């Protein structure tokens, strides 16, 4: 019933480098 989190672990990692890091460009520049 419960969906595996194996692919979710790496999923959040990608969003951390692609999305989160995207905001650091404007943040650090601020």
From Swiss-Prot:
Membrane-spanning intervals of the chain: 6-26
Taxonomic superkingdom: Eukaryota
Name of the featured protein? Notch 3 extracellular truncation
Q: Which organism is it from?
A: Homo sapiens (Human)
Please name the taxonomic classification of the source: Eukaryota, Metazoa, Chordata, Craniata, Vertebrata
């Amino acid at each position: 019933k419960k969906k595996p989190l194996l692919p979710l672990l790496v999923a959040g990692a990608v969003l951390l480098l692609v999305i989160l890091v995207l905001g650091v460009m404007v943040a650090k520049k601020k």
